Scaffold this active site. Structure first.
Site, PDB file in Angstrom:
ATOM      1  N   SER A  40       0.931  -1.237  -0.066  1.00 31.63           N
ATOM      2  CA  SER A  40       0.115  -0.076  -0.142  1.00 31.63           C
ATOM      3  C   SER A  40       0.804   1.291  -0.006  1.00 31.63           C
ATOM      4  O   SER A  40       0.195   2.331  -0.219  1.00 31.63           O
ATOM      5  CB  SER A  40      -1.042   0.036   1.025  1.00 31.63           C
ATOM      6  OG  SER A  40      -1.887  -1.122   1.178  1.00 31.63           O
ATOM      7  N   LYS A  43       0.881   3.451  -3.161  1.00 34.83           N
ATOM      8  CA  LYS A  43      -0.040   4.632  -3.452  1.00 34.83           C
ATOM      9  C   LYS A  43       0.653   6.075  -3.529  1.00 34.83           C
ATOM     10  O   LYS A  43      -0.108   6.637  -4.329  1.00 34.83           O
ATOM     11  CB  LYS A  43      -1.178   4.670  -2.355  1.00 34.83           C
ATOM     12  CG  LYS A  43      -1.901   3.226  -2.794  1.00 34.83           C
ATOM     13  CD  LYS A  43      -3.045   3.239  -1.332  1.00 34.83           C
ATOM     14  CE  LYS A  43      -4.309   2.220  -1.981  1.00 34.83           C
ATOM     15  NZ  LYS A  43      -3.433   0.685  -1.672  1.00 34.83           N
ATOM     16  N   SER A  87      -6.511   3.212   2.403  1.00 35.27           N
ATOM     17  CA  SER A  87      -5.612   2.210   1.715  1.00 35.27           C
ATOM     18  C   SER A  87      -6.722   1.615   0.670  1.00 35.27           C
ATOM     19  O   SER A  87      -6.490   0.082   0.752  1.00 35.27           O
ATOM     20  CB  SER A  87      -4.835   1.264   2.593  1.00 35.27           C
ATOM     21  OG  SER A  87      -4.016   1.616   3.264  1.00 35.27           O
ATOM     22  N   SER A 178       0.711   3.539   5.834  1.00 36.47           N
ATOM     23  CA  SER A 178       0.875   2.382   6.162  1.00 36.47           C
ATOM     24  C   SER A 178       0.724   1.252   5.113  1.00 36.47           C
ATOM     25  O   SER A 178       0.115   1.570   3.971  1.00 36.47           O
ATOM     26  CB  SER A 178      -0.038   1.968   7.244  1.00 36.47           C
ATOM     27  OG  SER A 178      -1.366   1.833   6.901  1.00 36.47           O
ATOM     28  N   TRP A 180       0.513  -3.230   4.467  1.00 36.35           N
ATOM     29  CA  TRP A 180       0.615  -4.699   4.713  1.00 36.35           C
ATOM     30  C   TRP A 180       0.433  -5.530   3.684  1.00 36.35           C
ATOM     31  O   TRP A 180      -0.757  -5.752   3.298  1.00 36.35           O
ATOM     32  CB  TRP A 180      -0.601  -5.023   6.056  1.00 36.35           C
ATOM     33  CG  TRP A 180      -0.552  -6.189   6.433  1.00 36.35           C
ATOM     34  CD1 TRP A 180       0.353  -7.525   6.163  1.00 36.35           C
ATOM     35  CD2 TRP A 180      -1.153  -6.785   7.625  1.00 36.35           C
ATOM     36  NE1 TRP A 180       0.073  -8.444   6.992  1.00 36.35           N
ATOM     37  CE2 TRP A 180      -1.066  -8.127   7.897  1.00 36.35           C
ATOM     38  CE3 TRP A 180      -1.953  -6.013   8.271  1.00 36.35           C
ATOM     39  CZ2 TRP A 180      -1.273  -8.844   8.723  1.00 36.35           C
ATOM     40  CZ3 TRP A 180      -2.630  -6.783   9.607  1.00 36.35           C
ATOM     41  CH2 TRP A 180      -2.312  -7.959   9.751  1.00 36.35           C
ATOM     42  N   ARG A 220       1.736  -1.262  13.876  1.00 36.25           N
ATOM     43  CA  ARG A 220       2.766  -0.738  13.105  1.00 36.25           C
ATOM     44  C   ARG A 220       2.987   0.754  13.469  1.00 36.25           C
ATOM     45  O   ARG A 220       3.979   1.313  13.714  1.00 36.25           O
ATOM     46  CB  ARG A 220       2.550  -0.990  11.594  1.00 36.25           C
ATOM     47  CG  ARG A 220       2.898  -2.301  11.082  1.00 36.25           C
ATOM     48  CD  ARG A 220       2.010  -2.463   9.851  1.00 36.25           C
ATOM     49  NE  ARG A 220       0.718  -2.378   9.889  1.00 36.25           N
ATOM     50  CZ  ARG A 220      -0.219  -2.089   9.047  1.00 36.25           C
ATOM     51  NH1 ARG A 220      -0.144  -1.604   7.868  1.00 36.25           N
ATOM     52  NH2 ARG A 220      -1.615  -1.953   9.404  1.00 36.25           N
TER      53      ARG A 220
HETATM   54  C1  MER Z   1      -1.820  -1.987   1.972  1.00 34.41           C
HETATM   55  O1  MER Z   1      -0.541  -2.457   2.119  1.00 34.41           O
HETATM   56  C2  MER Z   1      -3.000  -2.987   2.241  1.00 34.41           C
HETATM   57  C3  MER Z   1      -3.589  -2.090   3.169  1.00 34.41           C
HETATM   58  N1  MER Z   1      -2.827  -1.737   4.139  1.00 34.41           N
HETATM   59  C4  MER Z   1      -3.597  -1.616   5.266  1.00 34.41           C
HETATM   60  C5  MER Z   1      -3.044  -0.937   6.311  1.00 34.41           C
HETATM   61  O2  MER Z   1      -2.049  -0.393   6.250  1.00 34.41           O
HETATM   62  O3  MER Z   1      -3.783  -1.167   7.515  1.00 34.41           O
HETATM   63  C6  MER Z   1      -4.754  -2.459   5.237  1.00 34.41           C
HETATM   64  S1  MER Z   1      -5.867  -3.069   6.582  1.00 34.41           S
HETATM   65  C7  MER Z   1      -7.441  -2.936   5.705  1.00 34.41           C
HETATM   66  C8  MER Z   1      -7.881  -1.554   5.029  1.00 34.41           C
HETATM   67  N2  MER Z   1      -8.582  -0.935   6.414  1.00 34.41           N
HETATM   68  C9  MER Z   1      -9.265  -2.295   6.771  1.00 34.41           C
HETATM   69  C10 MER Z   1      -9.859  -1.822   8.085  1.00 34.41           C
HETATM   70  O4  MER Z   1      -8.979  -1.169   9.130  1.00 34.41           O
HETATM   71  N3  MER Z   1     -11.239  -1.847   8.472  1.00 34.41           N
HETATM   72  C11 MER Z   1     -12.251  -2.636   7.625  1.00 34.41           C
HETATM   73  C12 MER Z   1     -11.499  -1.387   9.650  1.00 34.41           C
HETATM   74  C13 MER Z   1      -8.318  -3.339   6.638  1.00 34.41           C
HETATM   75  C14 MER Z   1      -4.797  -3.067   4.214  1.00 34.41           C
HETATM   76  C15 MER Z   1      -4.206  -4.663   3.883  1.00 34.41           C
HETATM   77  C16 MER Z   1      -3.738  -3.127   0.664  1.00 34.41           C
HETATM   78  C17 MER Z   1      -2.676  -3.689  -0.294  1.00 34.41           C
HETATM   79  O5  MER Z   1      -4.783  -4.081   0.975  1.00 34.41           O
END
Ligand code: MER
Length: 237
Positions: A40, A43, A87, A178, A180, A220
């Site tokens: 991510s 981006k 993200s 951030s 993941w 993180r």
């Molecule tokens: C990027 O690397 C991935 C997104 N990165 C993050 C992150 O940095 O936290 C997430 S978490 C995902 C998005 N927000 C959702 C959430 O917090 N709720 C539904 C409450 C969880 C992703 C994994 C991207 C590549 O998917």
């Protein structure tokens, strides 16, 4: 500060850059020279490339098409900056498709982002390979962004900076992204950004760590802010 790191069984590095010197902290320092998928964090570069090449604006609303996304939080309308903080992959995949494979490839090479490889799939390359980047390259990329020193128009860099604005703490300001990456082994965790301190100094940072399915999403950022407090960069209010 070392004690903070091994309170987990986290395998992790934290890099800072002030425009002259790279500093490294953590449990696994060799991670900083090691290349990982940006996930991510890509981006930041996607936004820059898109604005610079007139494929989107910072006020355009990318609408939800009604088809359920990987997370329910992504089932709405986003601007690029809102999508940055949430993200929202499908919004940045739409952007990547507007950009197209040859321009995306030519642009990542032009700006020297990571290993500069995208392969054939313009909407997958930052999520599963072959694009990789080291935390040192990541700290320097966002430091340059902070200074307006990347090879993009100044107003483009400014727009993407504002997309990353996540906290004001007095006259200090935090900019961060951030990441993941779950579609690789092992899973990679990122928290990258910079602090614009009240005294005028910017310090850029990058957390890079091994993750796995159990892990709490806030760890993180918590870690990063913890370290930044300990270093004196961004004190808890
Ligand atoms: C990027 O690397 C991935 C997104 N990165 C993050 C992150 O940095 O936290 C997430 S978490 C995902 C998005 N927000 C959702 C959430 O917090 N709720 C539904 C409450 C969880 C992703 C994994 C991207 C590549 O998917």
């Amino acid at each position: 500060v070392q004690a903070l790191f091994n309170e987990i069984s986290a395998d992790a590095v934290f890099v800072t850059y002030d425009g002259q010197n790279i500093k490294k902290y953590g449990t696994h320092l060799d991670r900083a020279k090691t290349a990982y998928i940006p996930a991510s964090t890509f981006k930041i570069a996607n936004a820059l490339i898109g604005l610079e090449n007139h494929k989107a604006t910072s006020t355009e609303i990318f609408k939800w098409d009604g088809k359920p996304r990987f997370f329910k939080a992504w089932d709405k309308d986003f601007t690029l900056g809102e999508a940055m903080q949430a993200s929202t992959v499908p919004v940045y995949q739409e952007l990547a498709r507007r950009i197209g494979p040859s321009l995306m490839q030519s642009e990542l090479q032009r700006i020297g982002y990571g290993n500069m490889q995208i392969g054939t799939e313009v909407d997958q390359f930052w999520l599963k390979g072959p694009l990789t980047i080291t935390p040192i390259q990541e700290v320097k990329f966002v430091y340059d962004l902070a200074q307006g020193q990347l090879p993009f128009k100044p107003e483009v860099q400014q727009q993407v900076k504002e997309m990353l604005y996540v906290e004001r703490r007095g006259e200090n300001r935090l900019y961060a992204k951030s990441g993941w990456g779950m579609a690789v082994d092992p899973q990679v965790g990122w928290y990258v950004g910079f602090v614009e301190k009240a005294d005028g100094q910017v310090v850029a940072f990058a957390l890079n760590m091994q993750m796995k399915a159990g892990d709490d999403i806030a760890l993180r950022k918590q870690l990063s802010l913890d370290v930044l407090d300990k270093l004196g960069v961004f004190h808890y209010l």
